[PDB]
Write a protein that binds this DNA or RNA. Structure first.
Length: 276
RNA sequence: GCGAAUUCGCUA
RNA sequence: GCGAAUUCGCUA
């Protein structure tokens, strides 16, 4: 077997988005606030490259590619696991056929010290929300239980539509003053519970849970720099998507945390820069 | 983003 | 095929 090189893709939010530019009124998420990040595993050294910006939703992020380890070996089993996850990142999370517009892999702390997050990779592979919508069995006697902690750093998908390609959302807010019995913003339905019952024939087992504000996960491919009728229509679609209020019981939590998802969307730009 | 309708520009 | 304008449907 040939020896490996491991690089960390360092990310720091060096210029937070100014208020005048925060049109979608998002929270800002510095990548450096969470330890799990991405790295690159290669058989060749990567030539030294200067720091460069990607322009994300939260502002300008400085990217630095730094050597974490070299000269070590990995077993075939681990290389295959890493390979599957690289493919997973581009085919299932970003849904992209051309990663650069050798293997990206997750790194995490073992104690302020970055290494390949094998456990995280294994958890992904075991997740029932790994690809699509996981089965659930909420009944009156075994109802849905809302745990706030599970929604703090979550990406969620609706369990009740778009089965072939689910819409993924960041949880942007937890509305504790709302429940499924809150008033529905349309004269056609009295409550959120009635909407989901009438539209989808969905029953709820928990009428006390808070509701959720969401932010679509969609990102443009090239973030290396900071109009039309069609772009207008798309912008209007994204606005309505972001006005949606969802019911936790009716959604599934994706195994990839929001904090890591926010970093993943930078990957195509970074690989493009490295290759071109 | 996935669709529809109507109208206009680019070829000889 | 490469573009543009106007209008409508799908999410809560």
């Amino acid at each position: 077997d040939q020896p490996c090189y491991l690089y960390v893709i360092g990310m720091v939010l060096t210029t937070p988005l100014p208020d005048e530019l925060n049109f979608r009124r998002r929270k800002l998420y510095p990548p450096e606030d969470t330890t799990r990040c991405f790295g690159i595993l290669t058989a060749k050294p990567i030539p030294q490259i200067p720091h460069f910006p990607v322009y994300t939703r939260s502002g300008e992020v400085t990217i630095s590619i730094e050597l974490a380890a070299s000269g070590f070996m990995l077993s075939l089993q681990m290389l295959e696991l890493i390979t599957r996850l690289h493919q997973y990142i581009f085919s299932h999370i970003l849904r992209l056929e051309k990663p650069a517009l050798y293997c990206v892999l997750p790194l995490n702390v073992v104690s302020s010290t970055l290494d390949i997050d094998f456990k995280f990779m294994e958890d992904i592979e075991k997740s029932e929300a790994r690809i699509g919508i996981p089965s659930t069995k909420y009944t009156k006697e075994t109802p849905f239980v809302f745990k706030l902690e599970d929604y703090q750093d979550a990406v969620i998908i609706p369990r009740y539509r778009n089965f072939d390609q689910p819409h993924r959302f960041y949880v942007a807010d937890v509305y504790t003053d709302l429940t499924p019995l809150s008033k529905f913003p349309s004269p056609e339905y009295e409550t959120f519970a009635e909407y989901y019952k009438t539209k989808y024939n969905l029953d709820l087992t928990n009428l006390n849970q808070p509701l959720l504000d969401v932010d679509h996960t969609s990102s443009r491919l090239n973030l290396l720099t900071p109009l039309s009728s069609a772009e207008k229509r798309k912008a209007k679609w994204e606005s309505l998507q972001n006005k949606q209020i969802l019911v936790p019981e009716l959604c599934a939590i994706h195994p990839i945390p929001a904090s890591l998802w926010r970093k993943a969307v930078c990957l195509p730009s970074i690989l493009y820069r490295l290759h071109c």
